[PDB]
Write a protein that holds these residues in place. Sequence first.
Motif, PDB file in Angstrom:
ATOM      1  N   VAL A   1       0.805  -1.227   0.000  1.00 46.08           N
ATOM      2  CA  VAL A   1       0.000   0.000   0.000  1.00 46.08           C
ATOM      3  C   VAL A   1       0.866   1.320   0.000  1.00 46.08           C
ATOM      4  CG1 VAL A   1      -0.564  -0.315   2.474  1.00 46.08           C
ATOM      5  CG2 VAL A   1      -1.919   1.250   1.025  1.00 46.08           C
ATOM      6  N   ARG A 161     -19.657  22.396   1.705  1.00 47.84           N
ATOM      7  CA  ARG A 161     -19.096  21.158   1.235  1.00 47.84           C
ATOM      8  C   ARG A 161     -17.715  20.872   1.757  1.00 47.84           C
ATOM      9  NH1 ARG A 161     -20.999  20.713  -5.017  1.00 47.84           N
ATOM     10  NH2 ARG A 161     -19.586  22.583  -5.274  1.00 47.84           N
ATOM     11  N   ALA A 165     -15.979  17.931   4.117  1.00 52.59           N
ATOM     12  CA  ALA A 165     -15.020  17.146   3.416  1.00 52.59           C
ATOM     13  C   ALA A 165     -13.789  16.908   4.244  1.00 52.59           C
ATOM     14  CB  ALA A 165     -14.541  17.892   2.124  1.00 52.59           C
ATOM     15  N   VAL A 169     -13.483  12.885   5.577  1.00 50.47           N
ATOM     16  CA  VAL A 169     -12.479  12.102   4.810  1.00 50.47           C
ATOM     17  C   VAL A 169     -11.020  12.215   5.265  1.00 50.47           C
ATOM     18  CG1 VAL A 169     -12.003  11.314   2.434  1.00 50.47           C
ATOM     19  CG2 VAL A 169     -13.959  12.791   2.832  1.00 50.47           C
ATOM     20  N   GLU A 184       4.538  -1.003  12.120  1.00 57.07           N
ATOM     21  CA  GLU A 184       5.417  -1.845  11.339  1.00 57.07           C
ATOM     22  C   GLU A 184       6.876  -1.488  11.429  1.00 57.07           C
ATOM     23  OE1 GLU A 184       3.762  -2.143   7.311  1.00 57.07           O
ATOM     24  OE2 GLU A 184       2.017  -1.251   8.356  1.00 57.07           O
TER      25      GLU A 184
ATOM     26  N   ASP B  11      -1.901  -4.823   4.231  1.00 56.79           N
ATOM     27  CA  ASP B  11      -0.527  -4.572   3.988  1.00 56.79           C
ATOM     28  C   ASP B  11      -0.040  -5.586   2.955  1.00 56.79           C
ATOM     29  OD1 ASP B  11       0.141  -2.337   5.834  1.00 56.79           O
ATOM     30  OD2 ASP B  11      -0.965  -3.668   7.260  1.00 56.79           O
ATOM     31  N   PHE B  12       0.327  -5.019   1.781  1.00 60.12           N
ATOM     32  CA  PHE B  12       0.753  -5.776   0.630  1.00 60.12           C
ATOM     33  C   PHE B  12       2.244  -5.796   0.649  1.00 60.12           C
ATOM     34  CE2 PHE B  12      -3.483  -4.274  -0.772  1.00 60.12           C
ATOM     35  CZ  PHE B  12      -4.018  -5.469  -1.357  1.00 60.12           C
ATOM     36  N   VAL B  87     -12.997  12.931  -7.187  1.00 61.81           N
ATOM     37  CA  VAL B  87     -13.635  14.249  -7.277  1.00 61.81           C
ATOM     38  C   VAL B  87     -15.096  14.179  -6.803  1.00 61.81           C
ATOM     39  CG1 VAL B  87     -14.350  16.155  -8.900  1.00 61.81           C
ATOM     40  CG2 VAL B  87     -12.168  14.843  -9.155  1.00 61.81           C
ATOM     41  N   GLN B  89     -16.339  12.318  -4.588  1.00 62.40           N
ATOM     42  CA  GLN B  89     -16.321  12.237  -3.120  1.00 62.40           C
ATOM     43  C   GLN B  89     -16.163  13.526  -2.362  1.00 62.40           C
ATOM     44  OE1 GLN B  89     -17.787  10.735  -0.196  1.00 62.40           O
ATOM     45  NE2 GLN B  89     -16.769   8.922  -1.222  1.00 62.40           N
ATOM     46  N   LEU B  90     -15.108  14.249  -2.764  1.00 65.78           N
ATOM     47  CA  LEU B  90     -14.694  15.396  -2.070  1.00 65.78           C
ATOM     48  C   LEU B  90     -15.463  16.638  -2.529  1.00 65.78           C
ATOM     49  CD1 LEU B  90     -10.983  14.646  -2.553  1.00 65.78           C
ATOM     50  CD2 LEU B  90     -11.927  14.570  -0.296  1.00 65.78           C
ATOM     51  N   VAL B  91     -15.423  16.968  -3.826  1.00 63.13           N
ATOM     52  CA  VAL B  91     -15.993  18.158  -4.337  1.00 63.13           C
ATOM     53  C   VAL B  91     -17.535  18.034  -4.488  1.00 63.13           C
ATOM     54  CG1 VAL B  91     -15.812  19.948  -6.042  1.00 63.13           C
ATOM     55  CG2 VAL B  91     -13.836  18.485  -5.681  1.00 63.13           C
ATOM     56  N   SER B  94     -20.986  17.988  -8.929  1.00 62.50           N
ATOM     57  CA  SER B  94     -21.188  19.291  -9.431  1.00 62.50           C
ATOM     58  C   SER B  94     -20.034  19.948 -10.155  1.00 62.50           C
ATOM     59  CB  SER B  94     -21.577  20.345  -8.344  1.00 62.50           C
ATOM     60  OG  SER B  94     -22.774  20.012  -7.650  1.00 62.50           O
TER      61      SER B  94
ATOM     62  N   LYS F  29      -6.023  20.604  -7.025  1.00 60.06           N
ATOM     63  CA  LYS F  29      -7.331  20.413  -7.649  1.00 60.06           C
ATOM     64  C   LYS F  29      -8.224  19.417  -6.986  1.00 60.06           C
ATOM     65  CE  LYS F  29      -9.367  18.980 -12.278  1.00 60.06           C
ATOM     66  NZ  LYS F  29     -10.021  17.854 -11.551  1.00 60.06           N
ATOM     67  N   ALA F  30      -7.647  18.321  -6.457  1.00 59.14           N
ATOM     68  CA  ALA F  30      -8.323  17.246  -5.786  1.00 59.14           C
ATOM     69  C   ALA F  30      -9.010  17.680  -4.584  1.00 59.14           C
ATOM     70  CB  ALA F  30      -7.297  16.133  -5.501  1.00 59.14           C
ATOM     71  N   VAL F  31      -8.338  18.432  -3.733  1.00 57.62           N
ATOM     72  CA  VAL F  31      -8.864  18.700  -2.410  1.00 57.62           C
ATOM     73  C   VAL F  31      -9.911  19.763  -2.396  1.00 57.62           C
ATOM     74  CG1 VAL F  31      -8.152  19.035   0.018  1.00 57.62           C
ATOM     75  CG2 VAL F  31      -6.578  18.056  -1.635  1.00 57.62           C
ATOM     76  N   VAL F  32      -9.487  20.989  -2.729  1.00 47.74           N
ATOM     77  CA  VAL F  32     -10.319  22.139  -2.707  1.00 47.74           C
ATOM     78  C   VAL F  32     -11.092  22.343  -3.917  1.00 47.74           C
ATOM     79  CG1 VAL F  32      -8.758  23.309  -1.085  1.00 47.74           C
ATOM     80  CG2 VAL F  32      -8.430  23.721  -3.535  1.00 47.74           C
ATOM     81  N   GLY F  33     -10.546  22.059  -5.179  1.00 51.31           N
ATOM     82  CA  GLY F  33     -11.180  22.418  -6.435  1.00 51.31           C
ATOM     83  C   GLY F  33     -10.307  23.347  -7.226  1.00 51.31           C
TER      84      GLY F  33
END
Lengths: 210, 205, 205, 115, 97, 97
Positions: A1, A161, A165, A169, A184, B11-12, B87, B89-91, B94, F29-33
């Motif tokens: 991972v 939002r 978020a 998350v 580990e 754990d891989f 996207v 998920q978080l944003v 929209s 871009k991922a987090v906030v936009g």
Amino acid sequence: VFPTRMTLGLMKTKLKGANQGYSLLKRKSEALTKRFRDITKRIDDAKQKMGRVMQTAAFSLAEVSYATGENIGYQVQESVSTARFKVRARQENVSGVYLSQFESYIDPEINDFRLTGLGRGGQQVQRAKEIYSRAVETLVELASLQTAFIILDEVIKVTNRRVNAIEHVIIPRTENTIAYINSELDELDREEFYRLKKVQEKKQNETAKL
Amino acid sequence: IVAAVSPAGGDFSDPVTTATLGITQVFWGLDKKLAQRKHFPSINTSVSYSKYTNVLNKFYDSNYPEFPVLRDRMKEILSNAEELEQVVQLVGKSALSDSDKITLDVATLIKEDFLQQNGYSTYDAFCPIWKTFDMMRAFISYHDEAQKAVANGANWSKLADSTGDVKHAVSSSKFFEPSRGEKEVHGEFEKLLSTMQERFAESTD
Amino acid sequence: IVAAVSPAGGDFSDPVTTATLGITQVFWGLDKKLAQRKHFPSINTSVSYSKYTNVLNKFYDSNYPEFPVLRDRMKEILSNAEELEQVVQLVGKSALSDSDKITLDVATLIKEDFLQQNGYSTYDAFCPIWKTFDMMRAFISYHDEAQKAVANGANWSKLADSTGDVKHAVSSSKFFEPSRGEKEVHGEFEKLLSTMQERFAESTD
Amino acid sequence: AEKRTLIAVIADEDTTTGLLLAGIGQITPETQEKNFFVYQEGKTTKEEITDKFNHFTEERDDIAILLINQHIAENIRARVDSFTNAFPAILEIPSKDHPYDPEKDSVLKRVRKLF
Amino acid sequence: EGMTRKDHGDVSNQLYAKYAIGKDAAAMKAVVGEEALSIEDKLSLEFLEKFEKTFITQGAYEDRTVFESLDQAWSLLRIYPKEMLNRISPKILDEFY
Amino acid sequence: EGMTRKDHGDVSNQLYAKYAIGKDAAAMKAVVGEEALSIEDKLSLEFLEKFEKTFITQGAYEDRTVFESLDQAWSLLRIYPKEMLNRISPKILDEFY
């Protein structure tokens, strides 16, 4: 991972980032909601104020038309081919986000209209314009607030939002990664000590016995 | 040699899995999240590779299927799907574009109809390379015609409701025994191709 | 002893690095990620400390440099700039105070003129101790005018654009080394100072 | 940005004459079309209000503020509700012979969702 | 006692809480601007710089007991109104603000 | 010299700098936009993609001269002004831009 060596350095600064960022987003939401309550109250008032200013003027315009003895509105539409009262766009920062505002300026393209000459009845039409130029201006300055209010509603949704978020998350994703790699990493180190020790007991014993 | 191994708690990086992965040239995955919804075994493309994929497609092309051409687009779809999902998920949904909505739907369908081997009546029936190819012709076809359609102006809603029957059919196709016209091309898969064509046109204008 | 130290446990909290930081008095940083963008040595203010500062700076005051003043201010710019940068990433800013933009902007300059140096271009890494004093002197002065201009009124965009010609010259002054005379304080920098004040007036009004 | 400086009118005849005395609409020089829509009660079509609303909101991007009488806005409600942007702004102001009624107001519906 | 005041505890509370809000205020300012900053934040913005430059910043041969510390505390605090200073008894405050 | 230029080390440095930023611009871009993104970050995003599928993507029987590599690198790198490029001597960048 994920790496089992020095994920702790990148992950540690993320975790702090997240809780620090969250706190801060809450203040930006609090400010946005703070202003929002206030404008909602001011806007409902402003709707009645505009209603009235238009209505009182509108009636005077109706009266002027019946008393003189002809319908003016046709002639007025034909004469107009510029807009006297225009607006200049400007950005005003209210909270974090910039909203759009309008400031009217009066440009002298036209002064009245070239249609009045209706003898005695014509003074009623000239005066009617004077009362309306003032009424329209009240509407326009009030109208500016309306624009910002729609802009605030669009921004609050992006902001609600984000506050969700981060908490839901990001913060538990940082927690699970840091702790699992920590656990580990310490294990590799501990078993080594035990293996070095185990062979050294064998050595010690062999030396000791005759 | 097909050799099974087990991760130590997700754990891989545990010595056994890493060692076997060292020696192997093909890696096929297994995703926990996707097994919970019942899609086991669950192979994506970010946890798996095959060096044989390149030569293998050349040999299948020969035998009859169009496989190499469809394999490339198929890989892409899954690879974009994952990123596009983060996207959502978080944003939220929209920030998407319409073509990206398309990639999300086709993907969900692939997840179910290949990866799941779980029953609903009967554990799924022998599907060859030929069968597998037909499924791929119908999913890939759905995606192209739909994106064209949205690009060229059209409702999302109109397009998804319309595919409808065709989607139920591919899901359940694997339960039905192979050969239904032929092994090669089934009449059940042959007919959908026409249905998509008829839909694409209604949508456009 | 000028000693390089490096990881050896693969961490930065491995024994090797723990023992060395304790025994040393002077540390000047370096970051790998920024170094790749090519700006080596890419000093980390936070890990850096010096114990020697007080006695050494007293010595330098006698030697002619007004150094100590600039030094605190060099550090002060780079520190606030760091913090501001996390706030741009984290919230995903929709505005900045007009002063903070100046801080960030003045830090960018520090990056080029000092931090970006190449040890095989001797036009791009060489300055005597006085030349170094003059270049830093110019920066610290720019910050000082800029903070006052916003205060008296003027927009940031007005500040940046009207300052303009002298902003280009200071940026580009890192391509110099003594070669206009055996003199360690140059006309190159002394001229800039009076022109910079002249620029400030423009910005303000 | 600053590229929009026009006020369009959707209003009843007597109200549009007034606004025009003040001077806020015109006959454009780039398209030959008013920035006003003259409406009469029970003597003009429901379809025409719709066309005008669209034209000023989406097929015109030089309108800063579109004023609209609540009563007239009501006829073409689907279309008023459905335009949700702030450029141009859409502002319902009380119509003639009616005070403020919150049940005809497109913007106030948007505000309800979230605060 | 006799080498501290009993006012020691009350001031430790006040000093602490305002410095923390000020740390928040710095971050806030950067996002919101100064053209949208809150009036309480402004007092907190100033408080952050004076607590650091008076209480923390001091010379290499300066010396302090609790009485000296205590006088410098009240001059930082003076700027806040009495109604923002509420972790303190009304007694103490009316004497040292 | 004579099949690897003098500008070789210069151009590498520049190519890495635009790429570091491009990688980071994806992450914001991922987090906030599109909230912390801007005209500068948006260029960088384009850069990261064009570079990945043009410079790095080649054949496995393709022989590429060190002269070829440099010619292609400069063509790609046209995405920012000369004044935004200062990771290179202004002498060298005019000859080979």
